[PDB]
Every structure is written in structure tokens, then in C-alpha cells.
Design a protein around this motif. Sequence first.
Motif, short mmCIF file in Angstrom:
data_model
loop_
_atom_site.label_atom_id
_atom_site.label_comp_id
_atom_site.label_asym_id
_atom_site.label_seq_id
_atom_site.Cartn_x
_atom_site.Cartn_y
_atom_site.Cartn_z
N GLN A 80 -37.62 -14.35 53.66
CA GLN A 80 -36.83 -15.43 52.89
C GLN A 80 -37.62 -16.82 52.77
O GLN A 80 -36.94 -18.02 52.48
N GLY A 81 -39.05 -16.95 53.16
CA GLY A 81 -39.56 -18.36 52.79
C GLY A 81 -39.14 -19.25 53.69
O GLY A 81 -38.99 -20.45 53.36
N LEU A 83 -39.24 -22.01 56.78
CA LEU A 83 -40.36 -22.83 57.26
C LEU A 83 -40.33 -23.28 58.71
O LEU A 83 -41.22 -24.19 58.95
N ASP A 131 -25.63 -27.09 36.96
CA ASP A 131 -25.36 -27.04 35.54
C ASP A 131 -26.24 -25.54 34.96
O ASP A 131 -26.12 -25.29 33.64
N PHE A 132 -27.13 -25.26 35.62
CA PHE A 132 -28.10 -24.22 34.99
C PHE A 132 -27.76 -22.67 35.56
O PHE A 132 -27.36 -21.75 34.77
N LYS A 133 -27.44 -22.76 36.90
CA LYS A 133 -27.27 -21.35 37.37
C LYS A 133 -26.85 -21.41 38.80
O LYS A 133 -26.63 -22.57 39.38
N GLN A 134 -26.39 -20.26 39.41
CA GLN A 134 -26.12 -19.99 40.64
C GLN A 134 -27.57 -19.49 41.34
O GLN A 134 -28.23 -18.77 40.62
N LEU A 135 -27.86 -20.12 42.51
CA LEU A 135 -29.14 -19.77 43.23
C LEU A 135 -28.86 -19.75 44.85
O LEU A 135 -28.12 -20.51 45.19
N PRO A 136 -29.40 -18.63 45.56
CA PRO A 136 -29.26 -18.63 46.93
C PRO A 136 -29.95 -19.57 47.76
O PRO A 136 -31.08 -19.73 47.47
N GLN B 79 -30.68 -13.48 36.97
CA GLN B 79 -30.60 -14.64 37.79
C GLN B 79 -29.45 -15.66 37.77
O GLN B 79 -29.59 -16.65 38.17
N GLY B 80 -28.36 -15.06 37.43
CA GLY B 80 -27.12 -15.82 37.77
C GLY B 80 -27.01 -17.07 37.06
O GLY B 80 -26.45 -18.28 37.42
N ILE B 81 -27.43 -17.11 35.58
CA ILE B 81 -27.74 -18.16 34.60
C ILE B 81 -26.34 -18.34 34.18
O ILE B 81 -25.67 -17.46 33.73
N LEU B 82 -25.86 -19.73 34.13
CA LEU B 82 -24.51 -20.01 33.43
C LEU B 82 -24.76 -20.69 32.25
O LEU B 82 -23.36 -21.32 31.89
N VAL B 83 -25.61 -20.73 31.67
CA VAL B 83 -25.59 -21.24 30.19
C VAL B 83 -25.88 -20.21 29.12
O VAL B 83 -26.39 -19.28 29.49
N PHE B 88 -30.43 -23.02 27.35
CA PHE B 88 -31.66 -22.25 28.09
C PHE B 88 -32.92 -23.18 28.33
O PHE B 88 -33.29 -23.73 29.26
N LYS B 91 -32.68 -26.36 30.10
CA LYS B 91 -32.52 -26.47 31.57
C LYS B 91 -33.97 -26.18 32.12
O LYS B 91 -34.22 -26.98 33.35
N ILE B 92 -34.89 -25.25 31.42
CA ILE B 92 -36.20 -25.15 31.89
C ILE B 92 -36.86 -26.47 31.90
O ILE B 92 -37.84 -26.82 32.95
N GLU B 127 -37.89 -24.78 44.99
CA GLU B 127 -37.85 -26.33 45.76
C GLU B 127 -38.47 -25.98 47.09
O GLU B 127 -37.94 -24.77 47.76
N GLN B 133 -38.48 -22.51 51.45
CA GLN B 133 -38.94 -22.56 49.84
C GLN B 133 -38.15 -21.49 49.19
O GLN B 133 -37.81 -20.28 49.85
N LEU B 134 -37.41 -21.93 48.08
CA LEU B 134 -36.57 -20.85 47.44
C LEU B 134 -36.59 -21.22 46.02
O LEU B 134 -36.88 -22.24 45.34
N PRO B 135 -36.87 -20.10 45.13
CA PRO B 135 -36.87 -20.30 43.73
C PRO B 135 -35.61 -20.73 42.77
O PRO B 135 -34.60 -20.43 43.29
N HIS B 136 -35.95 -21.57 41.86
CA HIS B 136 -35.01 -21.92 40.88
C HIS B 136 -34.86 -21.38 39.60
O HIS B 136 -33.98 -21.08 39.12
N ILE B 137 -36.24 -20.69 39.30
CA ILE B 137 -36.40 -20.26 38.05
C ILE B 137 -37.75 -19.14 38.20
O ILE B 137 -38.58 -19.76 38.80
#
Lengths: 145, 145
Positions: A80-81, A83, A131-136, B79-83, B88, B91-92, B127, B133-137
Motif C-alpha cells: 500500500q505504499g 511510509l 471534483d475529479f474522482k474517488q480514490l482510496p 479509476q472511479g472517475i466522476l466527470v 477529463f 482535471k488532468i 500524492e 504514497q497513493l495514486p491520483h491518476i
Amino acid sequence: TGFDLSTATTLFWRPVPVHVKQQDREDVLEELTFRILTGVAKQNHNLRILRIHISSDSDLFFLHTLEVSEEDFQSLKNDQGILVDFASFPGKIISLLEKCILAQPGDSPRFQAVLTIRGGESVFKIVEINDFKQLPHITLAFRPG
Amino acid sequence: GFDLSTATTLFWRPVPVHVKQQDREDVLEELTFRILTGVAKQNHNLRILRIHISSDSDLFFLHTLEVSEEDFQSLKNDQGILVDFASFPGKIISLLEKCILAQPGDSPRFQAVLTIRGGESVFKIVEINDFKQLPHITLAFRPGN
């Protein structure tokens, strides 16, 4: 043997708003009781253990549980990264739970606790909804027992 | 086949990227990102979002992603994208801005990563906070134009 509930230290024990999903049910928002405790194994006070309990309150006192030994944490940490060290882990989970507790409908990003029950297992995650997405932000597997 | 001759460029500028490969040290480099919306040369009613990664130093360091309106559904779901498709790219861009603005003492700290593996690469914006650390996209890119 095993986790010594007797001398365990509870770090957090209170209700948290959760968005629940089961296959054959309607979605529900429920306050579930979350408990986070650290302790050691009875047969060896050198084995550190983290336990998390999730439950709906009832006179069955029935729990879904997750248990993470310091040894398990090595793998969990890498998948899960994460730290932080084992000792700091519960505190990080607690901070995420607090954001879920605080969250209000207009928030953005909004923090939200989510639970999905399938088969003999529950998957708990705390996500952010923006505003873009859901993320864990964290994902934890639970089991009855 | 993307029709460059009628495409609108939404974004065209450098972005600090952490470039990762298994047989070498990471390299932090300003890579140039061009984001354009357009239609297929073979079909001018098929909208396509194109993202092109290049380097001012190496004219043949080239990575491209093209997402059609229909491909976007699968991406959106994964990816649980809400737009919608039209939103798209914006948001990128917001996420790329966070990477451009990131500072050493940020928490959470945003970071652009490109991981190159054979004839495939994976671009992601993550981020890095006090916990993990966790991915946003996350986005699959191919070599070339």
C-alpha cells in the motif's frame, strides 16, 4: 496463545459514518463502531500486534476483525505504499477516521468510509471524493471471528 | 489515427517528472506535455483526447496516449472517475499543476512519475503524505508519436 485482549491498549473506540455495500441489499449509511487496539501475544510479550474491530451494535456483540502482527505489517506496508513504522500506523488510520467523522456533504475533497461485504469477508476503505474522482487513502480487509 | 491538423491544444508546457527504469537511477527531468482534443482522421465524429510526452533534450524520447470517447468509459470505471469526457482534460491539467507547483516541504506532496518498461510505460500522478504514497491518476502510454 495469541492476542492478549487482557492487556491491550485501546487507541480509538467510537462510531464512524460508513457507506455500506452488500450485493443483495440496498446501499446504507450506518454509524459503525470502530475500535483500534495494540497489544502483544500471550505466549510472547515480544510479539507486537494491532487489532481493528468493526461492528454494528447489537446484543450479539458480533464483530468483523482484522489482526496485523508486526511481521504481517512488512507486507501490508509494501502493498500500500505506507511510509510509517508499525508503531505510527494506528495513529495514521485514526487521523483518516477523524476526517470521515468530520466530513460534511459540500466538502471537496470529501473523506468517506466505505465498506463492501462479499462472501465471508468485508473490505473497508477510506476514500476521498473530489471534483475529479474517488480514490482510496487506505484499504483494509476484515473477517468475522 | 489522430487528426493533428484540426486539433485544439489545451496545454503545452514542461512538467517535472520522475522518470523510472529498472536498470538505472531515477532521473528528475522537465518533460514537455502536450494535451490536445480532436477527432480521428478516419472518423471526424469520433472525439479523441491525445496526450504527448516529449523531451527538449532527446527528440526521440516519445510517449503517447490517445483515449477515444468510448475507451474513456472503461478508464472512468476502472479509476472511479466522476466527470465526463469533455471535463477529463481539465482535471488532468489541475493535477499536472500540482506537480509543477510542488515544494520540498509539501504534505501532501504531489509528484509526476513515468515508469518505462519495454514497449510500454505508465504515467501517474501521486500524492506523498505523512502516511503513504497513493495514486491520483494512472495512465498507460505507448512509445512513439
